[model samples]
Target: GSMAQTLINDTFLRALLREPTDYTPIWLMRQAGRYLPEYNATRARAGSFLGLAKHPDYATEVTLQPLERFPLDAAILFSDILTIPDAMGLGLDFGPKFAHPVRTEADVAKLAVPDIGATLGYVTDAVREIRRALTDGEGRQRVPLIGFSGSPWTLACYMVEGGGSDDFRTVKSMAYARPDLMHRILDVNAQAVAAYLNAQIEAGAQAVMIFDTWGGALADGAYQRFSLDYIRRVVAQLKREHDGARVPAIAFTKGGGLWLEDLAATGVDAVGLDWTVNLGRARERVAGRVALQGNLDPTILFAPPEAIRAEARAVLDSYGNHPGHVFNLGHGISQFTPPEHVAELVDEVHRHSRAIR
Candidate 1:
């Protein structure tokens, strides 16, 4: 309560102010651009992934696309996490955006991190465009735009696998067995990511998050080696102020319950929880210095809508009041989630967390 009182009680904006809340703020990982029929229709018209992202108007329209459905507290930029790699002359593509392109070890060797000002220029243009897009015809609607990037380890995973993978053996083997080389890859990736996020802030993003989607899969020693170290470097070097508030950072390790305490110490404003974390323990363990983002299992969508609302409310209640908590699914909403389900998730969080109002 004091965190909200002293820091200004805008739940969505408080994270950027580095403050906590009495009731959790609400947003989903894929909040902006996925799982909605409108979004599907927009994406279809936006041409291909790269085509949509490359054009500022389309990017801005699509970025605001989710807000039309969810009534979410935040709207993340509608762009892929791997856009940086694609920009680095690595021949990265999203389906039909670019024709067939592949990278081999030789390609990795050829890939040097590009200058952010040059290589990632599209991101900032899109951000500035999206910032301008937040305006309304009646002039009252405003939703914060979140800029995000894949963690260095995650980018490396895609770079190595050439796309998504199942077991991730190729990336893991490189990370665990040949760590020197892996560190080299991560080193370059970290620099690129820091520069990219800084540019995003400059372009008008109010907050930023580093998605460590696969880091939890790392072995005991390897998790720190491959994931935590580089992320710590990014947070320490990140720009703390943007748009008159602190630029809150989120560190999400997909299966990282065991390392929650350690991850919190990286100076992130919030630690993202996957489905496995215990909420009461998370608050106790992190000692309330930072806020928390998620832990709702997405599979709950398969249940009846009432069941979905019941389960979602349980997570809201488990956090035992809001402000410091941000309501979100443990991971992205399932592709099959009824768009109505998201509206329900948003309605329930806003309905139940009435103290914020």
Candidate 2:
């Protein structure tokens, strides 16, 4: 266990644990991203997306960009979820490229979980540096630092399909056509994800999220066997605490509105809902077993500030005075989003949520 800095504003952590809070805490997926000009300038300096992430200094700078502009309650590490696959020597490429994607049993045999400290020391270094620099200019601890990874099935989709796909023909076909090989890949991913996130927790990540972005794509039974089961295994094996405080775990399956209760049953501290799920219904189903993070459509930011604020209020009202609600967009913010609009969204969530109480 590493010593953690005293957190001055732990609203996000408290809310995740379903503790009482004055208001709903707020943070967004990809909060530190291209919407800010500072991020773009830093990306340009680092030359490539992977290059920017692989270097701790550049990663630290971008990780805190959104905090400088908005009063967010958490800061997520600035790195790609696919870094795990890249570390396994899968020949991960940017410009949407992959030199070697797992396709056959032989390819699956070639895969091995990387030694985290050896291959991903940069990420832990970035986490340490980000935690050190997380305070405000006046040096107040602002919020918790969130570390994350893609769910096993989501990462396997990219690895099996080689890159982005409109329809995951290769990966899905493998799941149905060759269940044996699919399970092998997912088993390896489960072990790797557990080790990967545990390392992040030990490295000073205050909270961690597993993004099951593709789990929703599976059929009813396939999802349980192929996606949800592996996520449950990873959650069961995570380091649940460090530095005398609980390190909360969040499991988010983007199109998994239908399985909120099932997701919560996996023992995560929270279940992240995508826009397809109604916040009120999700809360009702989970029955407070775990916190609920979001359901706001990220596209709503394209509207005027008042419309953005109105939409923010709508999501707040939907959840309706819940102690465990953390306000956030259903997905990553668009790069084209006006930076000022996010400031409006955050303000509306904090103001309206506080008033609701």
Candidate 3:
């Protein structure tokens, strides 16, 4: 919302845009949260997860904690996906337990597109403060900042179930039995997600991503209708450019590997793959149409350095000198991960991938 610095390192954005870089850029999912001791220290100080994120300064500190411990190429906002639904007055907390779950026609009708400036301005404030933190005295950014939210379908899952689930049976049944109500929730979600991302871009997020975490849990045909289409709509409605620069978009579905072609066509700069997908074949399937962002098994970090390095080498080799490949874990890092192992992994990714270049 004010004078912003120029980028010193645009490797992540470049790779996301399907362009050549000196090496494949790397950043892990949940790099800023659990798995790192510093994160826990801050969480302890804040007294709770929500307390850590709601405060702009606290969120900015935790957001920069990972970069301080390692040489990551990007910094994601230290916030939760449920923040949007919370802003909508669902009163979502750390466990994503909803104060007012949307499970019926009346519940859906009560939902409103959040007036972001008033409801979630703290997030935008964090973006601005984080942008400042990543900048140097010369007004050059150390690395690009990424902003994200859940996809319409994914958000709806938590909204209906009122919390996390093993199978999301309640939400799916609602979708199957009352398609009209499910569609209405998705429509509001699309509008909310689109606007939320636009505000982040305006406040200075260099790139934006939509995490469709629950999309894979949907049935074959149901996923396309309830999840993919709404994601496409959010992508279409995003402000793709801000301050004369292109703000790249990434859409990631946790188990959406089989629909690579369809995801690529949704007008996003990249599609994220989970560990279950083959990176090389996924690259061929998209065939330069869109960039690819992951596929490394996060659990691999639990292995010894020798083994972790070899797995890093395998993921890089799988992509094989591709112009647009960003190294990342298939999902967020585990809470039990050895922090030093991440240091080893990040260094290994840079060394091995740059060697290929």
Candidates in order: C-alpha RMSD to true structure: 3.9, 1.7, 1.7
lDDT by candidate, in order shown: 0.76, 0.90, 0.92
Give the top-scoring candidate (lDDT): 3
TM-scores of all candidate predictions against the true structure = 0.90, 0.97, 0.98
Per-residue lDDT tens digits of candidate 2, residues 273-339? Answer: 8888889988999888999999789999999998999988989999997689988888999999999
Q: lDDT tens digits, residues 224-338, model 3?
A: 9999999999999999888777899999999998888989999999999999999999999998999999978998989999999999999999999879998999899999999
C-alpha root-mean-square deviation, candidate 1: 3.9
| Runs of candidate 3 exceeding 4 Å displacement | 1-4
Task: For residues 1-357, write the lDDT of model 1, one tens digit per residue.
Answer: 121112222577674344564445677876655567776777789877677777777788877777776677777877777777777766666532322223344555665667877877777888988867775665433767788999998888877776777767878877666666678778888988898888898887878989999998798888898989999988888999865567788889999899998999999888889888987689788878788888789888778889888887787777775347777888887778887877777787777766443
Q: Which candidate number maximizes TM-score?
A: 3
TM-score-superior candidate, 1 or 3: 3
Model 2 quality (TM-score): 0.97
